[PDB]
């Protein structure tokens, strides 16, 4: 009865009663059950599956500028059969591509989507070993990175069966610095990854107690316990934070992984659901800039970039934070362009995302947009995606959230 | 079937089909019917009214740190009677206060609410003439302004009857510069008020064709045609825009009314609904700063504050707009503090709004917050009201939107 709500930054939580007295949405919540897809303990009710699959295959053969009628029907029967006999079914890799592409084309909270059109699909379906996974990942990371010239790709591990033979990597994202909470009340690297770093420690991985130490991809292949693997340094291409003016910057000791790749997130297509399918794209300055660097609950410089900025660090009204940040954002962006790593300032992004929509509507007359997310964390009213009214909605295929593996995991370790 | 959506800034509109294919919110829309209260042609179905009123009166006698049981019951019967006999009813002014206070306390999109506790109620109920209204307004404006030291207040005009004896002022807000769209494809003052300025012209008011000319409060008292009245200059206290450094600023020729007072907006309490009740509060820098000044669809300096800022006005990625704005915001704020007019930089606001909630939950365990609105148009992720999860909802009493009078108005002019 009491809709729980939490203030991220502070980690505070309160239960809302009063909403009951409503005259008769929870749009500002982060992980609504309305956007996930948890575990299972048995396959997928044919009645449910079968009609979905028909839908998909139908969507698929829809694309073509020229129709493959026969193949369409044919494929249709082909599947039903396949399904009726076994229940489950496999998509022709070609399908899986169009899947991932659309599932992205149908991401509600991603300004990126303007080039959903071209992504790299890594058919790791045949995968079968934890260590087999790992390798498959590095192939990705390495392909993705491309020595700074980032290329976005996704590697589809094997789908779901009984839901007890799940394939899952327990990581927020491919590369992400640890976050040891040091003795002296301090806290290193990244507090965000605070609970998880503990995990990797609890499963081996030795605490280099740094503050810019990359975390171990912890994977599980069929439903058995997960295993720790250290990402091969050679693969993690970073960028150092230096200002095109404030020389005192480098002294900050700031750098950041040049590759944003989400690990934990379920892909769902034709009634089929894949519990592991890391995908990457390149950064937008502000996440690095204002989010991990500035956000109070993350790295959190600002105050310092403020003091050494000379600014009125103690007269809030001064707009010093407004000053500081803007410089920090120019640094990050700067560094990147310099050390030759791909990136994109928000403005240019928003300008393009809009172009996407005009295309998307004139195209299929829709575009699942989540304003609360598609708006640059700073400079909102200046980026066009603010004066844009948008309604969002889950479609298909679609990338979903998932429950923290460690929460719902039958530890086969007996 | 086609949810229409418009991009403000550009004035573009598109109909969303695709949402139908939804797996099964419109939170980013501006004026949902879910937040209004249009016309009527007959009173209010006793069955509807009577139970509401009971609710209210009950809420009322609830407040007290010490209960007025007898008076409570008494008042209750008193009303029912009053209602059963006539249907309608009047709230003891004292009630109307607690009304307005709560109706505010229950504003979903206002960071202000942290001091809902003290507002000024102007009982203009007895009003009866257009000209009678006018005077009543100036009393407000004048009280509100207070020679810069702004004080927030509201003046409750007479309630609703048959819904054909509506009391309404056709104004976005008390003071607001005109917006003539000059011959030479130009556009002066404020394009926002473009359709309305035409109106006042169509009803008399002479076009001083300026670009900082205050508009005429156009009012209607009982349901008859509306009449034009020029706000007495002496009452409109403005502020000139000057930078605490960029001397070349004053050359911009920028100033802005120091008093934000919303005209058109219905107050609803105990089943009773008042179609006219202007209320004011003091500015938050960013609306003036980034919204009316910078917003592409408004005044729109930025580019110039950019060029004369020296900045890379042509290399979007430069973050020049990010630079420009921040200065503009310091100016506005600056001027104000200088010319001694009340104002408040967003940061300090957000810091307080949060304090409100912690209070509001610990108080009545709720707080109708609309994240999409309660977030400063610039510097979002830096203000705490971003990492705050919030669900919003219409309660009571409550200030509602209303249909543009000129749309639904039986022009008694025969
Ligand atoms: C054109 C390159 C891309 C850019 C610049 C980009 C940018 C972004 C940004 C800025 C966010 C929100 C950041 C956050 O708050 O975590 C986001 C979210 C997201 N993007 Fe992208 N993206 C790109 C490509 C892609 C691709 C190719 C996919 C799918 C294979 C994708 C899927 C997603 C998803 C699912 C989210 C939501 C993540 C979450 O809920 O945590 N993006 N993207
Ligand atoms: C502490 C002084 C106040 C401050 C600083 C303040 C500030 C604000 C701000 C920044 C907004 C959003 C601006 C926009 O986008 O138009 C807003 C909206 C609003 N405020 Fe306040 N406010 C104050 C007092 C009040 C009071 C006393 C009332 C009720 C008598 C009130 C009622 C509203 C309403 C109804 C809205 C929504 C307006 C709309 O939907 O256009 N505010 N306020
Ligand atoms: C997922 N999030 C909770 C954490 C990583 C930040 O995510 C991203 C930040 C960017 O700037 S670009 C991008 C592209 C594709 C996937 C993710 C991102
Ligand atoms: C209503 N809006 C469409 C137009 C006026 C802007 O509204 C306000 C801007 C501020 O900074 S403060 C404030 C206080 C009380 C009412 C309104 C405001
Ligand atoms: C609590 C609040 O909903 C949350 O902090 C939000 N996070 C994000 C957001 N938008 C983006 N793009 N990324 C976020 O992390 N909007 C709101
Ligand atoms: C289109 C978009 O919903 C609209 O421009 C928004 N306006 C506003 C907003 N928030 C505030 N405070 N004021 C606005 O005018 N959020 C979103």
Swiss-Prot record, chains A, B:
It comes from the Eukaryota. Polyubiquitinated; mediated by SPSB1, SPSB2 and SPSB4, leading to proteasomal degradation. Zn(2+) binds at residue 25. Induction: By treatment with endotoxins or cytokines. Induced by lipopolysaccharides (LPS) in macrophages (in vitro). Expression in the liver oscillates in a circadian manner with peak levels occurring during the late night. It is found in: Cytoplasm, Cytosol. (6R)-L-erythro-5,6,7,8-tetrahydrobiopterin binds at residues 28, 291, 372-373, 386. Macrophages. Transmembrane segments: none annotated. L-arginine binds at residues 173, 282-283, 287. Produces nitric oxide (NO) which is a messenger molecule with diverse functions throughout the body. In macrophages, NO mediates tumoricidal and bactericidal actions. Also has nitrosylase activity and mediates cysteine S-nitrosylation of cytoplasmic target proteins such PTGS2/COX2. As component of the iNOS-S100A8/9 transnitrosylase complex involved in the selective inflammatory stimulus-dependent S-nitrosylation of GAPDH implicated in regulation of the GAIT complex activity and probably multiple targets including ANXA5, EZR, MSN and VIM. Homodimer. Interacts with NHERF1. Interacts with GAPDH. Interacts with S100A8 and S100A9 to form the iNOS-S100A8/9 transnitrosylase complex. Interacts with SPSB1, SPSB2 and SPSB4. Interacts with ELOC and CUL5 in the presence of SPSB1 or SPSB2 or SPSB4. Forms a complex with ASL, ASS1 and HSP90AA1; the complex regulates cell-autonomous L-arginine synthesis and citrulline recycling while channeling extracellular L-arginine to nitric oxide synthesis pathway. This is Nitric oxide synthase, inducible. It comes from Mus musculus (Mouse). The gene is Nos2. The chain holds residues 77 to 498 of 1144 of the full protein.
């Amino acid at each position: 009865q009491y809709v729980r709500i939490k203030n991220w930054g502070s980690g505070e939580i309160l239960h809302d009663t009063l909403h009951h007295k409503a005259t008769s949405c929870l749009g500002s919540i982060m992980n609504p059950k309305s956007l996930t897809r948890g575990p299972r303990d048995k396959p997928t009710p044919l009645e449910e599956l079968l009609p979905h699959a028909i839908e998909f295959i139908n969507q698929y053969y829809g694309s073509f500028k020229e129709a493959k009628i026969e193949e369409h029907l044919a494929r249709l029967e082909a599947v039903t059969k396949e399904i009726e006999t076994t229940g489950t079914y496999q998509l022709t890799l070609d399908e899986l591509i169009f899947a991932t592409k659309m599932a992205w084309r149908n991401a509600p909270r991603c300004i990126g989507r303007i080039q959903w059109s071209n992504l790299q699909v890594f058919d790791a379906r045949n995968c079968s070993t934890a260590q087999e996974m790992f390798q498959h990942i590095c192939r990705h990371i390495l392909y993705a990175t491309n020595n700074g010239n980032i290329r976005s790709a996704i590697t589809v591990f094997p789908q779901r069966s009984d839901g007890k033979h799940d394939f899952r990597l327990w990581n927020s994202q491919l590369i992400r610095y640890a976050g040891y909470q040091m003795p002296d009340g301090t806290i290193r690297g990244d507090a965000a990854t605070l609970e998880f770093t503990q995990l990797c420690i609890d499963l081996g991985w030795k605490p280099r107690y740094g503050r810019f130490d990359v975390l171990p991809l912890v994977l599980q292949a069929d439903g058995q316990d997960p295993e720790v693997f250290e990402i091969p340094p050679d693969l993690v291409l970073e960028v150092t934070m230096e200002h095109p003016k404030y020389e005192w910057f480098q002294e900050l000791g700031l750098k950041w992984y040049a590759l944003p790749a989400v690990a934990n997130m379920l892909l769902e297509v034709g009634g089929l659901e894949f519990p592991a399918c890391p995908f990457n794209g390149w950064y937008m300055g502000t996440e690095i800039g204002v989010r991990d660097f500035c956000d109070t609950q993350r790295y959190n410089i600002l105050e310092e970039v403020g003091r050494r900025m000379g600014l009125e660090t103690h007269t809030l009204a001064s707009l010093w934070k407004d000053r500081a940040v803007t410089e920090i954002n120019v640094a990050v962006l700067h560094s990147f362009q310099k050390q030759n790593v791909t990136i994109m300032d928000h403005h240019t992004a928003s300008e393009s995302f809009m172009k996407h929509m005009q295309n998307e509507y004139r195209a299929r007359g829709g575009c699942p947009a989540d304003w609360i997310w598609l708006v640059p964390p700073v400079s909102g009213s200046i980026t066009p995606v603010f004066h844009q009214e948008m309604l969002n909605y889950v479609l298909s295929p679609f990338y979903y959230y998932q429950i923290e593996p460690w929460k719902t995991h039958i530890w086969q370790n007996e």
